[PDB]
């Protein structure tokens, strides 16, 4: 029924967009090589380019936010919504919080259907069904324990229970997050109009569903939408705070700017809603996806958004829908999550290379700049480290910190609550543990296995140490070579005397800024 949207003429938008991407890449590369072949002014130029990109993104985000806030329209509670949740080994506390949040959603009960799928049918997963039965005791609740999946009878019972009852709980054999999502989507059928997806560690605000329905009911062109998912445990560790700041920056700058042009690249898994008809149209193709990083099968929320964009339906984003989701506090769990995210992004980049002619040019621009940024950053860092002077390394570090400080100041301006100044410490995490993680994710696209287990039997998987060790060894060798060369250089001349004083003052300022940031973080985490 939903027609596959397509622009009026191909070979006329596709060619122009591909040529624009190639021209942009060639121009950026040419400027980079020109700077490389013919120290302060080059880094300054890079800083101004990043600053201009930030101003463009922030202006578009502000315009979108003002448009959303100004525009309003009363909602007619006539569209059915189905919340689908998946649980592998979730902690009882997070699961109970999610269940209560779903139950207390400020939506009519005759237009809301809750379905939960448990990834496991053994005796160690019956507790999730027990809590589900305890929570929705007074409603039309139906529970089943399947002995298999859709790709292993019970199919008729599962479909009947899902389509004929409000609250449904189904166990199934272990098949990963893809299997539970596929089972829920297949059992949905055509019962509802909107399908909202949610993880079993996400607490939902009461007005999130209402606002998402409002933004999806304004125009028929929209096919998917996402919300502003936040962190419910931002004080568990230092990395949790950084994850919260990064989440807020993402969902309030990048998502808003993409929604201004209706090209939201990714819809958050914990908070996302899709049109039922389109979802049922592309479900089978979504499950049967491969040829990404060799021939390994894939499928996730990012692939769902990519399919929605491929069919021609634009994806929106509203800031009035709020949710809280937990994030890893351990360093290695966070690294594994980042590697999995980067693997998914790299796999989806090839699939989303096409479909660019359907939704604007900002998608292509953002995709190409995000693809080329880490490589150029790594090349610049390697060149400046291998230059062989303490001077160059010192201003390299100083420029990396000044750019981060300016970004954090602008973030404080647009946010308005001043806690955002702590984001300036994200450089020490991006340039030491995130770039090697990205390289590892690029080098091992053919592998899989999620990486992080459920929150019952927390486990190890200390694999990311190898990229970290390699990066640390490379950096240490570079700094050692530079310090050796500069110590074996000439001195006692006025130029070198002034250089020594300037670098001493720069180091003093750097350490003062570092201790100021540390004191501010300590005071804000203690008081």
């Amino acid at each position, epitope marked *: 029924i939903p027609k596959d949207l397509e622009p009026k003429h191909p070979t006329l938008w596709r060619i122009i967009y591909y040529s624009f991407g190639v021209v942009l890449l060639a121009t950026i590369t040419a400027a980079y090589v020109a700077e490389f072949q013919v120290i302060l002014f080059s880094l300054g130029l890079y800083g101004l380019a990043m600053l201009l990109h930030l101003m463009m993104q922030s202006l578009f985000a502000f315009l979108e936010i003002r448009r959303v806030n100004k525009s309003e329209l009363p909602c007619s509670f006539k569209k*059915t919504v189905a919340l689908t949740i998946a649980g592998y080994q979730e902690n009882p506390e997070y699961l109970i919080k999610c269940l209560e949040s779903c139950k207390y959603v400020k939506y009519p*009960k*005759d237009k809301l259907k809750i379905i939960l799928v448990i990834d496991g049918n053994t005796e160690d997963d019956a507790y999730m069904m027990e809590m589900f039965k305890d929570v929705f005791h*007074g*409603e*039309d609740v139906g529970t089943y324990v399947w002995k298999g999946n859709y790709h292993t009878e019970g199919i008729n019972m599962v479909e009947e229970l899902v389509r*004929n009852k409000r609250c449904v709980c189904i166990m199934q054999q272990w098949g990963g997050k893809r299997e539970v999502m596929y089972t829920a989507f297949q059992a949905i059928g055509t*019962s509802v109009d909107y399908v909202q997806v949610c993880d079993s560690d996400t607490k939902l605000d009461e007005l999130a569903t209402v606002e998402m329905v409002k933004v999806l009911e304004s125009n028929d062109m929209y096919g998917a939408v996402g919300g502003d998912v936040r962190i419910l445990n931002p004080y568990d560790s230092f990395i949790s705070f950084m994850s919260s700041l990064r989440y807020w920056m993402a969902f309030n700058v990048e998502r808003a700017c993409q929604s201004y042009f209706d090209c939201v690249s990714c819809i958050s898994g914990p908070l996302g809603m899709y049109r039922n008809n389109i979802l049922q149209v592309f479900l089978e193709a979504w499950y049967r996806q491969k040829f990404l990083g060799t021939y390994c099968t894939l499928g996730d929320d990012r692939h769902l958004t990519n399919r929605v964009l491929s069919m021609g339906y634009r994806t929106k984003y509203t800031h009035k829908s709020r949710a809280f989701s937990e994030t890893p506090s351990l360093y290695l769990r966070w690294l594994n999550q980042q590697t999995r995210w980067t693997k998914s992004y790299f796999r989806e980049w090839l699939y989303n290379a096409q479909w660019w002619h359907k939704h604007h040019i900002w998608m292509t621009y953002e995709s190409v700049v995000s693809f080329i940024f880490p490589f150029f950053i790594t090349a610049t860092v390697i060149r400046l480290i291998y230059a062989g002077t303490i001077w160059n390394v010192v201003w390299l570090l100083l420029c990396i910190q000044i750019m981060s400080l300016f970004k954090s100041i602008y973030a404080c301006w647009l946010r308005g609550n001043f806690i955002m100044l702590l984001m300036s410490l994200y450089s020490m995490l991006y340039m030491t543990g995130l770039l090697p993680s990205k390289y590892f994710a690029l080098l091992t696209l053919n592998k899989t296995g999620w990486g992080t287990s459920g929150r019952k039997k927390i486990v190890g998987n200390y694999m990311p140490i190898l990229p970290l060790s390699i990066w640390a060894a490379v950096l240490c060798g570079g700094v050692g070579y530079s310090i050796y060369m500069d110590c074996q250089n000439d001195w006692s001349t006025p130029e070198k005397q002034k250089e020594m004083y300037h670098l001493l003052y720069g180091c003093v300022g750097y350490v003062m800024y570092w201790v100021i940031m540390a004191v501010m973080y300590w005071v804000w985490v203690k008081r």
Partner: antibody
Amino acid sequence: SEVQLVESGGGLVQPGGSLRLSCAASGFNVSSYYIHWVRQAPGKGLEWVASISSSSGSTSYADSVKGRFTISADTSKNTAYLQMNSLRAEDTAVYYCARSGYYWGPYFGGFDYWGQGTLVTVSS
Amino acid sequence: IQMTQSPSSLSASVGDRVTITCRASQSVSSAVAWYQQKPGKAPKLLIYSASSLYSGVPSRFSGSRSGTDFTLTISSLQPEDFATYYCQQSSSSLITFGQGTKVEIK
């Protein structure tokens, strides 16, 4: 527990008067399910009258019921309530109180756990 | 809006297959249910959603859908299966019931 529905309020009423019917529910919650009223005239078949859903405000009536009868519910009392005004001779039947789930798409679930019947006699 | 139970009367012996079909003006977004009512007794649900069967009833009763036609079939007519069968179309703001189709012994 066991789901039960009891209808009360039937009797003889002069034409043009007002009548009250109550449907008491046990074993479940009124707000979690739909409640419908079905008429069965003597010698005729089942005829729908009105329906309501608590905690949502949804209300429905038949063409010949609109403007005359009203249906409400009491979650605290767990009782459906039907007030009928401007009664006529054709209104005599055996009223039934039924329970059901929700409508969703093309799947309903039907009227399960039917209640008993109550007699209404509208004559002079 | 308009519902028509075609037979309106049927006379079959014990063990004979019984087929009762119902015609609806529109069934795009409305479910069809089949109930059984005995003389003087409240009706009991037999088939819901026009394909599924209620729990606890004998497996003999079967429901089928073809276009705008909805069919209820009984394989073996038990001596306790003689009653009046009602075909109902359920939808928001409009519910319509059937009539007739009383199976009687011959």
